[PDB]
Every structure is written in structure tokens, then in C-alpha cells.
Amino acid sequence: VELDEAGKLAAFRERYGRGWDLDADSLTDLISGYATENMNPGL
Amino acid sequence: APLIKMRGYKGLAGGGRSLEVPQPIPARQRRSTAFKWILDVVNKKPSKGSGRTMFAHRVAEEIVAVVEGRSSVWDKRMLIHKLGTANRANLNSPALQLKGKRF
Amino acid sequence: AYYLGLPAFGPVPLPRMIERWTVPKSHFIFKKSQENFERVTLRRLIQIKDGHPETVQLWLAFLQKHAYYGIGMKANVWEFSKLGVSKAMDESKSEVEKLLETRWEHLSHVSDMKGVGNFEDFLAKERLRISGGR
Amino acid sequence: SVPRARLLQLVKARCELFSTTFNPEGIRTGNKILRQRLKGPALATYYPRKNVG
Amino acid sequence: KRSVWKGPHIVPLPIQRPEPGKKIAPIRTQARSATILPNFVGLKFQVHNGKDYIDLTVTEEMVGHKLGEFSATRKPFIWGK
Amino acid sequence: VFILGVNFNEHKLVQKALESFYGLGQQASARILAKYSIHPRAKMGTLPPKIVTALTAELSTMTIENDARRLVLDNIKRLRDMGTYRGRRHAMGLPVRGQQTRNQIANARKLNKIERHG
Amino acid sequence: PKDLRDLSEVQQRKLMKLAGPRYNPEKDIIKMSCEKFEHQAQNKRYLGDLIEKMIAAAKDPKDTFEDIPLDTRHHTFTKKISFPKEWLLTEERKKELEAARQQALLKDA
Amino acid sequence: GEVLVNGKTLAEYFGRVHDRESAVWALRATNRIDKYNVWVKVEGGGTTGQAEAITLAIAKALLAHEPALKPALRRAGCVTRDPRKVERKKHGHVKARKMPTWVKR
Amino acid sequence: QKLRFKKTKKSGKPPLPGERKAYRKKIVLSNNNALPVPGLETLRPNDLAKQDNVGSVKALPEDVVDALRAMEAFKPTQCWGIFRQPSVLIRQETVDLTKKMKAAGADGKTIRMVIEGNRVTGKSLLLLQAMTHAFMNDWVVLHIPEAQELTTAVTEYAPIENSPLWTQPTYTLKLLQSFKRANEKVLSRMNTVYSHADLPQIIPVNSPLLQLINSAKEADGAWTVFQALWRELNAENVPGRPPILFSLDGLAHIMKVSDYRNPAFELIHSHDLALVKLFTDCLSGATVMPNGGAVLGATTRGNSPRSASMELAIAQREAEKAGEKEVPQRDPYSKKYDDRVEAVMKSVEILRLKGVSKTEARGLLEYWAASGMLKKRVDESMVSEKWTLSGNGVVGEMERASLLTMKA
Amino acid sequence: SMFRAKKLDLGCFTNVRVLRDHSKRKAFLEAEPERQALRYVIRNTTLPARTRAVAQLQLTQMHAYTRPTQIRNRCILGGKSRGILRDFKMTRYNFRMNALMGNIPGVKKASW
Amino acid sequence: SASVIFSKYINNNNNKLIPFKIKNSDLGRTRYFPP
RNA sequence: AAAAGGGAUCAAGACAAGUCAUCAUGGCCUAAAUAUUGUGGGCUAUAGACGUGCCACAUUUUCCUAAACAAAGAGAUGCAAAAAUGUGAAUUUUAGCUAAUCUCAAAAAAUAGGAUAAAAAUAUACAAGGAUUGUAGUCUGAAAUUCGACUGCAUGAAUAAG
């Protein structure tokens, strides 16, 4: 599983590491936790 | 170096044609026309060698061809002299003396 | 500088400071017509040598009191001092306090001035407001 | 003709003396932002404030 | 963020992973400069192009690009009709 | 002589010959000559038949061929399949790098394709 | 550095090294400024305390830095030209020219 | 007849024989190259600018020794001060006098 | 489609290979228009060493010009084709250097010298006078015309097995071909005295030494023949072995890292080239010449890089000679020095060249005037004028002001 | 709009965009240190990856008026944004009209 | 004695002496300098 | 010294010339909108065509090496040396100067050497040229996708002087 034929996942992880890679880790709540209701008016 | 120059008067030879008339030229104008002909023949010749003497030697060779009479500039000198002899009468043409004297 | 015994040298004519601006003569389109403006700053230098430090400060104090309009001035003062500047400036405290006994009358504030707040932060911010930003 | 490891001992002495940052590896420490002096108060005074009328 | 050492440009997004087999709505975003992260794979975005929200489904080939690179702002120029 | 199936004239520089293959440039050219002790000003007719064979075996182990074109053609093909902005500029033969399109887009109209020359 | 007579030769040189770009080899003066603080009095006190450390560090016998040669790459030395002293028309040179002026006439004659 | 320009010799300074002859033209015209030693110190300008500047400098210094040479330095062209100067750039022009392309239509 | 206007599309035999390069490198050594200078003497075998000849111009013999031309002693930048007969100015520097070569070859010693000077002061031509004194006195001249052809990576090069050195076969071959013609007379008198096992051909001992050189017909075995030849010329105790003059022009090129690349793509040092490694050893005294001779290295300013090591060495040797208690030292923080360049230049002798004296400048001007190439009255007033415009008598600059002018 | 003072405090030429640019100058003054802290944590590669990512998000949520790039000088006499001279706070034209009348000290028509 | 730092500013005395030259040319009246 | 030169200035009037989008102003309109605030987009679109420049089309050009000569201007909303690191953009760290002092900062052409030629038209000799595109980076800035500027590697279009 997790086949990247184009090599974009390997290129990303080589530059920024595996902190933003999904699993189950900076993505725990940094992106979602900061997303609040009515963040920007007008959708 | 030629001895004369061809000046033209606009619209005085007939149906829109110009009246060519010869005139003498001072020394500086004679040498300038001559040496510029030589450089014109030089620039059109092909390259021969390398180094810093290419242009210099290419010009010097044309200077020698001129003194030996085997150069191409001699044709341009005789060509302009023919126009002078073929138009020596235009110095007193009726058009050059009747500009605004036929009201 | 002569009455104070200060040997002055000059006025030395320093190079002129020339600013340049080229602006269109018309507010709107016309661009092929511009004109040049400038602001040339004329300046001189008076250098004093072998001048007593205190005497040099009376000279400067005199020029500022009787300054001529339209002239800006800047002075660089030199002075020789011994090693141990930390201790020298601590011993001169009592000397400066005596000279200020009659000068404290210039300032006056209500008891426990509250508008100031943090003393140091007040000077730093009030100085910017006086100088216009910096 | 002097070892680099020996020069750092002198460069480090200056830092301890003049109290500067000793970063021989050229690590990005964001100190360029700390040295940059603020410019807010210089820009805020651009437009003159309302005054006597 | 172009320079690699500063990491990618991240923006707050309501990216809540749904339960297995749950119906999750697409994410409407005007952050056309948000970098597509590896954790965006499988999510459905509706990127704003100025007037409309062009739909998008992130795949593993898009990781590293910006969301705005998949929603055209102008219409193709066509001469005649 | 022949290098990797391409015939070169005697009066041709060995470096200019290697640099004629797609993907092989100045850096790779200088390192291939240094590997076999060939001075940059070596002509083609001076190489012994032994070294001419070594170059062919050397280039056969490199990505200097249609193989190098595939890498470029695949990157362009991917940009289109994903539906990106750049990918749609290659297909329409338009400038891809933000150039202004009001004038002077000749080379873009001529070379920008999905099947580019390389 | 030579005004600090309480330092030895090795110690005075070590001080020139610690100063770094603050030392002017041509004039032999260590110039250093300070504008880190809000008040001019504080900038003077800092330089005063700083010079005491420069001297204390120079007296430290731990490392004399004698191995390190004095680096003067921060300074741009200037070379001045002077009128040749051999050309000054003195009573002795006048006799020298008379000889040359006369030998020239003979050689051509 | 030793000549120095900014410490360097006349040939080590001017890499163009035309400029060397012009710098000491006053001495050459009056035939006194072997009678004086010159120690010049030039500043600013270019190769030809400095060369012609030394021509007038030596001519004036030479007249201090032999004032009766001015009639000769006149006909040699070493007494006159050439006032020609680069013309400034003028707004609306590409250069001092070159104008941009004028479009009739 | 586009309607704009577009210029719709649409002589002599070309030169042969090497014709252009040979045009800017040919050397003319005569001019039928020039006048024959009356009283012009030819160099005798012992004229470049007489103090009395200082300041006089003399013509080179005919056979010498063939030898000097063989080993490319003349150069296109030099003014030879303006006069009828090649002549040189016997110079106070020539007598000094030549008197040392004379004593060196006679006493069996070896002088290791370096020539230095300004842009055009007579460095390359002072060697031409050293080679001239060598040919006339029956020496073996081994000259390297341009040292940049050994360092700029413009010739074939191959490595030596089990050693860091590198050979240059195509150059070593061409070097032997020119070595024969120049020294054809001296070599004819010498025979081999050693048994050289590995050679392109079998060669028994006591055979014509000129035959050994003709074995190198291909570039491959060129270097092997050279080393064998080098052993013969330096025979320890053999009667009839003349001194050797190993000269090289452009010393600044062999005093740095060369432009060649080894298989690891690392710049090869010039002292690793087998041929350059030989000259530096002879110049440093490592390789001794049993028969004696002289090893002269002339620097150059036209197309010459800067090596702080060579310039520092030249400065230190001149300081020690003058006796200055303080000698220039390395910049303790500069990284442009080379330890190997210092070792080679650690004991050489320096010969600084400067402008000629006003007495020598006259002898050179009178030669130009007698040839009708300088239409002026050569007198003290005219000599001092050219001597001044030439920057205190720099011979190179004195020609541009008298011969290459546009006033005559 | 939240950054516009309910009482006008401008004595120069007032304009819809002059009030807008004056509000940005006051907002950036109040939040420049707070903004410099975020810009420092981001560029500090010695901090944890999470620390740099938190500051990188908070810097994106600050209002636009707090960004200094949105501050553009205007003419205090006309209110334009094109052709402004920093030394005078006016357009190239108002500088010309005031320079010729003598209202800009030291300036004079240049000629050389 | 004196300090070395003090002596390093005494030697820098290459001043031009005020000559009190006598004018030999005729001078005109200066222009009217407006306020 | 001198046969000097340049700049600024250059009227009234006409063109109902330009500007009611600098400012200012009469009349007439909008006043929950023809006013005000933010997020994103657009002003950067492209069939044909018209104006300004830049650069190239090699032999008086270009390329390589070296130890020459300028003026003026800029740095309190900042110029940044030296050193170290990187092929490079640049980074690390700040000495000094708020300046005829310190810094940007180094002139280039030239001068003098050197290398390359069947230097594109005979296909086994395809010149010079640097557009187009791929890819890896740097700097500024919340932000570089629409839509920024430079750097490395690769790609190598037209272009015969019109």
C-alpha cells in the first residue's frame, strides 16, 4: 500500500519530513483546531 | 580619388526626373570618398587568417592593388567621371536658369 | 571662541549636499515635459583645538542661546578621561546633586505621578513623540 | 597557515567578551529578526493629527 | 513558502477525518495559496476561483501544489463563436 | 567514428560530440573525458579504437537518451492529467511561466505541446 | 594599547587580537563605539566597563594567543609616494649634471 | 629626463604611446626632454584626459624656468586650456542631445 | 493567420586545417626593403660574454637561426620581420648571465636561475641569447617554447602505472622532433653507453645516439625514449658529454595546479606532469646534472596567471642576496600559497630585467636608423626622448615608440 | 472598520483611502512586536517543528491591517498614492506647485 | 610626561599658514544680497 | 586661458487642446447606495494588427589571463566591512558610520598577451545565438497558484544585417 508512482509524497517528505503525513504529527489539531466556526465571512 | 561630385536638382529634368550636374570637391572630400571606397571593398572580402592583423593586412593589400591599377575602386572612379562628362552641358541648362522667371 | 580662549580654525567650506528631483510639469498625462529641482545644503566647519572641556561647553551653550534662524548645528566634543569610568561617574553624583539643588524647581508633578507609569518606558516613548517618530 | 579549530578559540573569546552570538555552524537561528530595529513608530506619525481650528 | 527550510504554507482548514463509511461534506476554501499536504489526500475541496467554487479531489500526485492551481480564474480566450 | 550508434567526423571535438546527446551537457561531458584521460581539445579522429568503445559503454550506463525525454514528457503529461493550470497551458500552446500574452508569444505557440521535442 | 603600561608585550598584543576589527594597525589605536542604550550616560558606562574586561582578559594567563598571528585583513593599508630626494637640485647634483651635460657633447662630437 | 607619473614610470602608467608623447609634448616641442626631470601627480579623469592635463602642467612649469619659450609653446599648442566638457543629460533626451524616436502618426 | 510582412528566406575556397593558426604564428625574419646595415658584425662563438660588446648590435649566424627557429625561440609578438638580418643587442644582462653559463659548463657545475621583469623587458629574448651561446659553444639545448601548452590541458595526457605522475605523449614526441634538428651537430658526435631494455626498437650500446631518438615514431613510446635519452646526456663519467641548457619560458604556468582532471575529477598539480616534474627537479637541484649546464626559467606577463608562492620566493631570494636582515614572509592568513612551489624556488637565483641604459639605447636606435626604419637624427637629444617615452629604457616599449608608430 | 477611530484624528487632506491607510499605520504600530515574535519563531530552525507551525498559523490569522506591506504613503494634500515623494509627503505635482511658490524650504528650480 | 593617545594627535599638524597676502587686483562692489 | 559651451527662462492668442479621477468649484444627479468594511478574483486574458525599447544574427565581434585610469550619487523607514559557509543566488555573525571620517564600492571600454576556423550552404565538419520548457534552490513578504525577482543543472527556438 501507499504507492507514489509520481514520487510526490517522497519529494514532500524529503523536504518537510513526515510531520504532515496522515496516520491512524503536526497535523493533530494545528490545521483543524484553529479552524473555528465562521472563520471568514462569505464562505 | 575623384575630381568631381554629382549633385541633383529635384524635378528639373523632365517628368519628375532630377537634373544631375557635376561640381568639384576639395581635397578632404576627395580623400574621404577614395578611402571609403577602399574600406567598402575590404569589408566585402572574405576572411583569410587569424590574430590582430586581419583587418590591417586586408586593408594594406587593397592599398597595393590600387597603386598597381588592378583594384576595383578604379572602376568606381571612372564610373563617376563618365557621369560628369555625360552631363557637362547641364551647367547651363534652361531649367537651372528658369526657376521662377516664367511667370 | 576668542574671548573664551578657544583657538578656532575655519570656517572650512565642506562639500555641498545636492538633492535632485525631476517631476512632470503637468499633473496629468503630459510626460515629455519635465523640469529639474534641487535642494543644495551649504555647510561650514569650525574646529576648536586645545580647548578646555568645560570652556567648550560654554561656547556651545552661547551659540545655542543666540542661534541664527535658518541654521542647523551639530557638535562633536572630545575629552580625555582615566580608566575606571564606572567609579568616576559614581563619585561625581554628589557633585552634580549640589549643582541641581537650585534647578529642581523647573520640574513639578503631583504626588506619586501616575500618568508616567513605567519611568524608563515613558522617556523612550515620549522622546519618539518629540522627535516625530525617531 | 593556522588551524581553523584554533581560530575559533579566539573568535569565541571575542563573543564572551563583547557578548555576541557564537554560531560557528551557521545555523539559522532567526537572530536577523532580533537585530532588525522596529519601524512601527516611525510610520505611525506619517499623517498629521487633527489640531487647532 | 518557497524556501524549503521554512516549511510549507499551512492555513486553518476544517479538515476533520470522518468515521469509516461516514458521509463527509467537501471543504469550501478561499485559501487558494494553501499547500496540498500529504494528509489532504482523499479529501474533496471546493476551491474558490473568484466567482464559483470549482470542485477538487486531492490525489497523491497533487501533494506539493497549491489549491489555487486547480481552479481557473479566467476563461479561455476563444476568437469567434 | 561511432559513439552509441551515432557517427561523428574526425575533425569534431570529442567534447562537442558527447554534448550532442540529449541530457548530456557540460558537467557530464567534462567528467566523462576526465574518466578516460581525454583532454578537452581532443579531436574525434585521434581517439584510439579502445577508448571509443569505452565511451559507448560509458554512455550506455547513463540517462542520456529518449529515456531523458520521457522524464520531461511525463512531468508535462502529469500536469495535464491532474488538471493544473500549467498543464492546460501546455495543451493550448500558451506561455506557461506567467508571460504576457498580448504580444510576443511565438515560441510558446510553436513549442508548448504535450508531446514536446524534449 | 601602549598607554596601558601595566601590560607586558605579550599581553599588549593579545589585546590587539581581542579587539579584532576595532584595532587600526596603521595608527595603532583601538577605536570602539556604543549606542546600545537609551541614554548617552549608559553608553559611556558600558564602554568603561567593557575596556576593563578587555584588559582583564588580556592579563589572563590561560591563553596568550601567541600562536595566532595578528590579523590585519580588516584594514586597507595605503602607500604614499614622495618626491625623489635624488632629484633635489643641490650644489652636489649641479656638478653631477655638468658632467652628464658635458659627456653628452663629447659623445656626439 | 626622468619622468614619473604617480610614482610609476611614463611607460608603466600610459599603455598608449600617443598619450606619452602628449604628456611631455611641451618638452618635446622645445627640444628639452633631456634637460629637466618631471615628477607628475595626476588625479581623476581618464587616460587621454590625464595625458592632455599633463601637457598644460609641464608647459606652465617649463615657462617658470625659461619664460622666453611661450611664443614656441603657443605654436605647439601647450599654453591653451581646452575648456571642452561633457554636456549633462537633459530630460526628454536619451543623452545630452540624442532625442527619442518621434512618431508622426 | 498572420498577415504581417516577413523577409522570405534567401563564394570562395575555404582555408585548410591549421592554415589560420599558422598565419598568426608564422615568424618573418627578414625584409628585402630594409637596408643592409654597414659594419654589422656577426656573433662569434664568444661574443655574448665580452664586456666590450655591451651596447653593440650583432647579427646571428645562419646556422643558429635554423636551430633557434627549430625549437621556436622566436615569437610572433617580436619585431623581427622589419629588418633584413636578425640581430640582437648585446646587453649588460647578457654578459652577466653568459659569463655564468661559461664558467658553469667549464667547471661542471650547474646554475639554476630565474628571469623576472616587467611586461616587455627582454625576458623571452634573454633566453634566445642563452640558447644562442649554447648552440655556438656546442651545448645541448632543451627548450620548452610555451609552458602554457603543458598546463592549460590542450594536449593528450596519460597516467603512469603505480605513480601519481602523468605523461604527455603527443607533446613529448613533438619535443624530440625539434630536439633533433636543433642539436643535430652535437648529437652526431655522441653514442649510447647504456643498455635500454624497453624501447620501440632494439638498440645496442655504443650506437649513434641520433638513432635512439629516431625510434620514437609514435606518440605512445615517446616518453620512454625521452627518459632513455635523458640518461645518456647525463652520463656520469663519459668523455664528450657537453653541458645541457634546460630552459623553459612562462614559469608562472608550472607553478600552480594544472587544468587537467584525474579520473576522480580533481585538478592535477603541474609538478605531477612527468615533463614538468623533470624541469622542477633540475631547477630545485634534486636532479643533478653530472656534466653541468644551466637551468633557466623565464617568467612572462602576457597571458600569465599569478602564483603568490613564486612571487614570494622571487622576493625572498632577492632579499637574501641584498643582505637585508628582514626577508618577506608569507601572509599568515592567505590561502593562495603552495608548499611545493616554495621548495622548488628555495635556492634558485634571480635575474631582474629593467630598462636598458642610455648607452645601450643608442646602439639599438642607430641599428634601427641605419636600416631606414627610423628617419631621425640619432643623437643624445633623440636618444633621451625615446629613452624617456620607453619608461627608463624598457626595450619592448622603445619599439612601439620608434618602429610601430604611424608617423613614418 | 473596527480599526477606524470613531472620532476623526487627521488634520491633513482627508479621504476615503487616507482614513483607510491611517488606520493601517495605527494598527501596525500596536502589533509590530507581537508580529516580530511570530516572524522570529518561524525563522528559528532551532525550535521544535510544532512550535514553528503554531506561530506560522497564528501569523496567518492576524488581521490585514496589521501587515506592514499594506502601508503605502499618500499625499497629505491630495490623497493620491501614485508619484509620492517620501521627503515631502506629496505627489510630484504638489511638490512642484509648492516648490515654485516657496512653501517647501530649501527647494529651488535646478539648472546646471 | 604625556599620553601616547595625546601625542598621536599633535603630529597631525600640516596646516597652511595664513599668508596675509597683499591684493594687487581691483575689486568691485559685492551684489545686493536680498534678505 | 579665451573665436568658448550648456541649462533655466521663452509672451499674447488660437487649438471650446488635456485634466470636473490631484486639488478646487457652479449647475444637475445618488442618499439602504451612484456611500462604507473584509475574503478571493481581476487590472497580468489573446485570433489579427499598430507603436516604444532590450538583445542577437562571430573574423574591427565574442571567449580566456593580467599587477591601469572616472565622476556623481546613496545610508535614522539603514549602508553594512572583515571573517567563516555554499558551485551559485546567499547564509552565519556584526566592526565601523548616520558620514569630505565609515560603508555600499568593484569602474567598464581601453592597453597588452593568449585560445578557437572549411568558425552555418558537400549532413560523418549543423556557426554564433539564449527564446521556450523540465527540475532543484534562494531572497522579500501572512501569502509567490492565477501573479514576483535572482541562482544551479538540463532543454537549445527563430535569427545570413532586414
Ligand SMILES: Nc1ncnc2c1ncn2[C@@H]1O[C@H](COP(=O)(O)OP(=O)(O)OP(=O)(O)O)[C@@H](O)[C@H]1O
Ligand atoms: N636585446 C634585445 N635586442 C633587440 N631587441 C630586443 C632585445 N630584447 C628585447 N628586444 C625586443 O623587445 C620586445 C620584447 O622582448 P621580449 O618578448 O623578450 O619580452 P618578455 O619579457 O619576454 O615579455 P613577456 O612578459 O610578455 O613574455 C621584442 O620586440 C624584442 O625583440
Ligand SMILES: [K+]
Ligand atoms: K556620455
Ligand SMILES: [K+]
Ligand atoms: K552574448
Ligand SMILES: [Mg+2]
Ligand atoms: Mg586584443
Ligand SMILES: [Mg+2]
Ligand atoms: Mg510588437
Ligand SMILES: [Mg+2]
Ligand atoms: Mg616572455
Ligand SMILES: [Mg+2]
Ligand atoms: Mg500663453
Ligand SMILES: [Mg+2]
Ligand atoms: Mg473638447
Ligand SMILES: [Mg+2]
Ligand atoms: Mg489633439
Ligand SMILES: [Mg+2]
Ligand atoms: Mg475627452
Ligand SMILES: [Mg+2]
Ligand atoms: Mg467631483
Ligand SMILES: [Mg+2]
Ligand atoms: Mg480587495
Ligand SMILES: [Mg+2]
Ligand atoms: Mg496595465
Ligand SMILES: [Mg+2]
Ligand atoms: Mg564580505
Ligand SMILES: [Mg+2]
Ligand atoms: Mg551598487
Ligand SMILES: [Mg+2]
Ligand atoms: Mg561565418
